[PDB]
Amino acid sequence: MDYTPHTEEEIREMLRRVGAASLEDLFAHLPKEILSPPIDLPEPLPEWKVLEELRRLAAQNLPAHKAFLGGGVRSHHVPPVVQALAARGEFLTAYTPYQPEVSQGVLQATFEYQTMIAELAGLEIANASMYDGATALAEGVLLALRETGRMGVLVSQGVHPEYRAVLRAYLEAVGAKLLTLPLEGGRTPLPEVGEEVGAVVVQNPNFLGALEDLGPFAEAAHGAGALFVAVADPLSLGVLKPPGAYGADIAVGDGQSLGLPMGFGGPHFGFLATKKAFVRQLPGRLVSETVDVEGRRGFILTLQAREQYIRRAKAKSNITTNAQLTALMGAMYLAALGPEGLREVALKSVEMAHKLHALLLEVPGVRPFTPKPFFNEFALALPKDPEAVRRALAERGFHGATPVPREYGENLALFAATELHEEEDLLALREALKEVL
Amino acid sequence: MDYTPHTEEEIREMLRRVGAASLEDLFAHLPKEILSPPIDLPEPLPEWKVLEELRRLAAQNLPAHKAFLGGGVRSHHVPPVVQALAARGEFLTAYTPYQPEVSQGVLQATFEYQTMIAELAGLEIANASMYDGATALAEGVLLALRETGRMGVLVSQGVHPEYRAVLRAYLEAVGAKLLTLPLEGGRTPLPEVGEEVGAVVVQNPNFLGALEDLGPFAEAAHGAGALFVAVADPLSLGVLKPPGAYGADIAVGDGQSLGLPMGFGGPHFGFLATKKAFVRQLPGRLVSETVDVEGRRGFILTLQAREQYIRRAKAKSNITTNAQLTALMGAMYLAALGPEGLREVALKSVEMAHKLHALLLEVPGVRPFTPKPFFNEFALALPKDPEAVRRALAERGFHGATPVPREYGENLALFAATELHEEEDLLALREALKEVL
Amino acid sequence: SFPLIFERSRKGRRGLKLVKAVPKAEDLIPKEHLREVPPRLPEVDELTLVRHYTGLSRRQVGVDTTFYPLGSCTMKYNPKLHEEAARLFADLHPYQDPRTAQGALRLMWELGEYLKALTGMDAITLEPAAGAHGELTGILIIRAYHEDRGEGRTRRVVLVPDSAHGSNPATASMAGYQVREIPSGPEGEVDLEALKRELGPHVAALMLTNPNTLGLFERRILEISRLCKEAGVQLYYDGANLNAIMGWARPGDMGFDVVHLNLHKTFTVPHGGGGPGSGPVGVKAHLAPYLPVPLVERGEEGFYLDFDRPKSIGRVRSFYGNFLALVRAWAYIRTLGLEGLKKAAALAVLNARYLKELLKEKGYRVPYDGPSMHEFVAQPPEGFRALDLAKGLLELGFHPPTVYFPLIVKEALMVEPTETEAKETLEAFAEAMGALLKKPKEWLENAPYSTPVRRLDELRANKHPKLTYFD
Amino acid sequence: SFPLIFERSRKGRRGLKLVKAVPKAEDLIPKEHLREVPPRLPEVDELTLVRHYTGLSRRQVGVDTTFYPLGSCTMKYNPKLHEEAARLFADLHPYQDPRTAQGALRLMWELGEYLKALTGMDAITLEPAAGAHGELTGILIIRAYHEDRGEGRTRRVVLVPDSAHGSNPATASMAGYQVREIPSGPEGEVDLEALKRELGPHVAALMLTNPNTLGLFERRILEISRLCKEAGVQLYYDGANLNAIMGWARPGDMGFDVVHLNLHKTFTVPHGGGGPGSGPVGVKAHLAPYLPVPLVERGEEGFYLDFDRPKSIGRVRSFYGNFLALVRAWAYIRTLGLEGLKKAAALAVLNARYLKELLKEKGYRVPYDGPSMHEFVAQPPEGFRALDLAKGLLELGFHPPTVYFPLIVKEALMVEPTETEAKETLEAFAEAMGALLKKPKEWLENAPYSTPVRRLDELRANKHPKLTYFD
């Protein structure tokens, strides 16, 4: 089936109108030897049949709703009011607002998005969002290297391993150096920063769920003339001292925690907030308030001149677009919960996490890894292989024990809890783990 | 939790402005003995917890998708584009359009709805919709009685038993007389119509799926001075001669077959079409085209004077509202499919039904009952109790053998097929039936 | 201007394509049963279909976009949560083995249990539709009661207040009852003396809303009940104003024998531009056997649909009622709980009173203003017509309240803000209401101006009606 | 006038309440780690939230409401079916046992196979995001290839046509390459003499879109490929214009070694106001080893994520890519099949070629007009600025095409109607474009007038920027 409206009569008139003998004639100037190849694709299907097939594939999976898996993605409540609103056709089907006069809905929401992000980070400004947390980190780091004119980077191993991988790829692309600060005791020790370093990167909460006082890290970086980049989960900023309060120059993170469906790691949007002082080097889109010809308040994409300041030297960047829709869902979420609602969701998640921690620690052979204090995620050392445990758990109907790369230690498994987990759910999981071990 | 926006200081100030001491004080004037009774309701739950419970409850049921059950409701393809459109907050949360200047969305859609129902029934006009098919019938008959000034009604037993039951209740309310013409070989025999009769009702297809020639019935009715009322499935109207081509004065039916979700029988909307000559006695809402002060095309609720004619004597009605949203879903469906699309869906469900009927007839003990020609539904005599068969079938994962009341015959079960049933599905059902039998 | 779906149509144009192998009509059914001329349904593509309805929705307003202070309609926020809840139960067939629909039957049962606990009723049906369908059901139940008692020929009158909504008397009359009006005192409440001479073995029932149509609670409701009982008169409760007293008082404790509820008013079910809806009817034990069939019951073997009721009035609608609506109302109650509903009633009342004070500031008059409940009835100052102010509101971005009702108040403005509207919203409304009174008569009489369409020619619509595109 | 969400909030007001018993911070987190000052987030109830965003949506346009002839963006209808499809896989975690996510993995694998068949590629990554992300991925792959063959220090140049989008050279330049611009012929196609003169062992790759940015198919593509292979130059395919040739020609058969696709363009994934999107990258056998990790593979035991790629360039973004977008693309392809995609391309080209004729009749010029494909570049007659014509379009209820691109055509209007727009819509648009040329100069330079806001002070926005509410 197809979506074209053309009736055969209309197709005839149009072909005659452009001087074509047929649809095939439209491609007559292309090289004949490669036209209409015998491509193999399954035969077309009516929409209902496509849904049946989609449902059958979904039935092959074990849903992860209320899962205990963590490490960048968690099963939080996805408020239907946010999803209903982001489903409005005007938001779903619009494109980059290059014509501001008919795009005030998108331009204003983006403005509100930037201010909410800058507040959560305790910083002055923020762009209209990045693809995800990892790309946001890469871009934030390049901003720093550009600002200081340096090419050296120090990153804590506590930073999400995939984030460090995306970062390595970008740094390798622009010709920069990356040094990884190994974690000891689950935290990152204060490093001695050389003048070749333009950026120091630390995550809080840790990838293993550990809280880290970033204050001294920022000092260590400024003392060497380097910039400090903080990677923080937006949801945790609801109750944790923000990077801005620590004196961080740049703050990045992933927005999946802000009510976005997990969608197998798909749904994301990265945030990037910094000081107005570095706005020339700020990548991505920027929406500014302004006024129309008769004084009405309006919003519009601004400061595109930045494209020049960003490519004038080393550590170039080329962000062409953002993650508008998902960033919009984030803003709707932040606006739906407010300062207190966000704080509550964060605390509940931390509470159920700490309670789960104490429960799992009772299983024989199970020892803690992540030190105190930690947030809503934690790593435990298991007596069996974590990948084997996760599978055993899955076979029992539970999703847990997200495997930690062994660069952090052997037999380590991450666990996360959210506001939708209850006392009874933790006990269930513990039981299961008990029997698995 | 609650949806109230009032903050504590806001509540206090408002109370001071209305001269009330507290919230409870607002009810000070009610008699003390009824005040704040101990009502027992479960404790409040946060939205996610509520969804979790809904899901638990839904997990108890066996989904009826691709079900083979019939008798008024059938599992047809519910198109997402229609559901997405009907979900637009403006349609979903608007009220009856009494202020037309800001309700042209609903009003125009309703006007388009009306013309679609009239075309499908092959009649001149139609109201904005009734609650369901059953009530649509009761109101139609009453329109027939007020019109003719008589109080006698002849109803074919072929009409869905529930529609008749609803009709019976409505007739007893206004003090009319209801006579039922029993089916002979699954078909309604041409009755003799006396002058005491004002309405003759027949359904095509029959409740048992048999096609009935409405021609003779129209004549018989008109000969006696009675009006002819036809009960028809809207979907079937896509390929079957409509009640208007047969002479029917009034046509009613249920719109669930127009892509509406089954919703355990909840979702419905009844249509009512008739002669423009009887508009004066038409119940429900009516939208007319017109113009505004400057000549712009507009739509508005009209002819409210009908209320008087309807209550001037006997068989009066009092339908104060309709089924706007669901009627609208029907409209979007008809528009989404068009004439040829509707015809295809009808023909397809018919083809599958006939294939099924052939297969089931091969099972030992299964005897036909519904005579040919029949539409997309049919009844068969089973070697065992239909209810028991339906249970046995359900236990196997199939939804079939919808029970037919003993009034139609012994051990009779109905089966239905839709455009989403494939031969493989027909064969699977037959195997299951073969097994239990 | 905006095009009609029919004008957008093009001969042979296709939208949805749900069949891959279209069978020949001729091979499946005999020619004398096949449609000759196809119905003139619109022929449009999907994109067009989307543009059309999306475009229509943008020429429309709802609670989602505007403040709807409609008296007796309770235009409260319809939580998006409930839409998600309902599609969870879309794939259920009414006739499937009840053994496989226990989740749905249970939800129906629990809701029935909650509504009964809220209204003080002993049994309940969730079958009746919206509008007056439930009103009719309740009236037919009362008639069955008297009839079963042998008083069918003497119980011929139904009493209604002079402020009642026209639907009350219309339903009774339809049910064959003679409707007699009873005046209200100068306070706006029932006239007890007048009532006393109306009661007797000739009255079948008294229909009332409480608070009444003026938004005033009937302070002597217990006396009215006492009088109705000594005379054997059934006290009928029109639940349109239940929102004002949810949790603070049960109508059953007030003496009402039957209660008509509106899920699309009090329990957040969306108004949908008219419908659909749900009007459950709760009744006291003595009227229980007359309830329409079927009812949802709980046995040891689970939940089942019960039809075994010899005295039932029969069936008032197909299947079991608007199930999805029930789902939504269930969610609402399980969300708020007693305290949530109570708070709701309280702030719905607070809002009305607060908004009444603001309007009285600009001269709007309140003929009967005792302590207001969920709504109130005002009149514009002398010299202004409710119609023009209503059209003025449209231009200003608001939606007027219920106008011209009750009829005992000229130029009536029945205002019900509901508990979900904010203080600053009430003020913005009062502010627009006051500004319109400063507008020249000519401005008011020709409003709106910027709406998609301006005042419509109602005369032409009535004398020259065009009910379809193919008139 | 439309209020900001921050203006809608009230101190202490609550919206969503997801926690029953909120714990005390001091009991879970040490004082020194606790936020001192709360973030200044909005404090609004749910109704307000709905009013705010619904209201914002009504101050916005999309494919759902307006014709979007945006050149190089392929603004085609986004089937609502795909949104239903997407929610079916919402509850999946990337780190759950892959043995329990076979349906998602299988879908990713199949989409992989489909995209490869349409593209003529041997391997593919579905990981990269929208924008230039996939573009960067492909370039890095070309660099890895040369570096591995030991010519990394010599292959230092990337060639781009003068009509290329700034994105191409910006990405290459960011990857450490020196970019050389190649002029096109009088017809707007690649100048073969200029290319031959320019090719050599120093050139890492040649980046092209085919059809090119002028909407013209590069008729000598086979010669260009032969030339590039002779010099060992990798031919890179920017897939922005794939919509013109789906099914009629495979980029692989034209000699392209790497293909950058855009699901949010050619395969209906919604544009969502800028993103998110998906930019898969297809590759010929000799480049597959450098693909970013992980890739979705099929084994006898099942589908799995392959990370064992010793020569991989690494990871370019988190997890596995925009999975929900992949789902949509999959649904689309499984809906149309080869014949549906082939027909879409044909009609996308017919619509553009037809609209071009209509615009030329309306007085517009077409600098490079050989047979037009899915798009074309027009210019207004001398004296008119595309900028002004665009603003007038806004006033006339249409959305302008891409403006001021490609750069080689002054006052350029890059028009791409896509296959889902109707014939009469193209005509209505042409009528509007024509009527604008008849409008007085002042009316044009001061448009729009009826839109939510008129022309905006872009200068104040740049010199006096206000990037946040609290600025």
UniProtKB/Swiss-Prot annotation, chains C, D:
One GO cellular component term noted in the UniProt record for this chain: glycine cleavage complex
UniProt catalytic activity: N(6)-[(R)-lipoyl]-L-lysyl-[glycine-cleavage complex H protein] + glycine + H(+) = N(6)-[(R)-S(8)-aminomethyldihydrolipoyl]-L-lysyl-[glycine-cleavage complex H protein] + CO2
Record carries keyword Flavoprotein: no
Alphabetical UniProt keywords: Oxidoreductase, Pyridoxal phosphate
Record PTM N6-(pyridoxal phosphate)lysine, positions in chain: 265
Disulfide bonds: none
EC assignment: 1.4.4.2
InterPro entries (alphabetical): GcvPB, GDC-P_C, GDC_P, PyrdxlP-dep_Trfase, PyrdxlP-dep_Trfase_major, PyrdxlP-dep_Trfase_small
Cofactor(s) the protein needs: pyridoxal 5'-phosphate
GO molecular function annotations of the record: glycine binding; glycine dehydrogenase (decarboxylating) activity; pyridoxal phosphate binding
A Pfam entry, by short name: GcvP2_C
GO biological process: glycine decarboxylation via glycine cleavage system
Entry keyword Oxidoreductase: yes
Described purpose of this protein according to its UniProt entry: The glycine cleavage system catalyzes the degradation of glycine. The P protein binds the alpha-amino group of glycine through its pyridoxal phosphate cofactor; CO(2) is released and the remaining methylamine moiety is then transferred to the lipoamide cofactor of the H protein.
PANTHER family for the chain: GLYCINE DEHYDROGENASE (DECARBOXYLATING), MITOCHONDRIAL, GLYCINE DEHYDROGENASE, DECARBOXYLATING
Subunit structure: The glycine cleavage system is composed of four proteins: P, T, L and H. In this organism, the P 'protein' is a heterodimer of two subunits.
Family: Belongs to the GcvP family. C-terminal subunit subfamily.
Protein name in UniProt: Probable glycine dehydrogenase (decarboxylating) subunit 2
Native source species: Thermus thermophilus (strain ATCC 27634 / DSM 579 / HB8)
Taxonomic path: Bacteria, Thermotogati, Deinococcota, Deinococci, Thermales
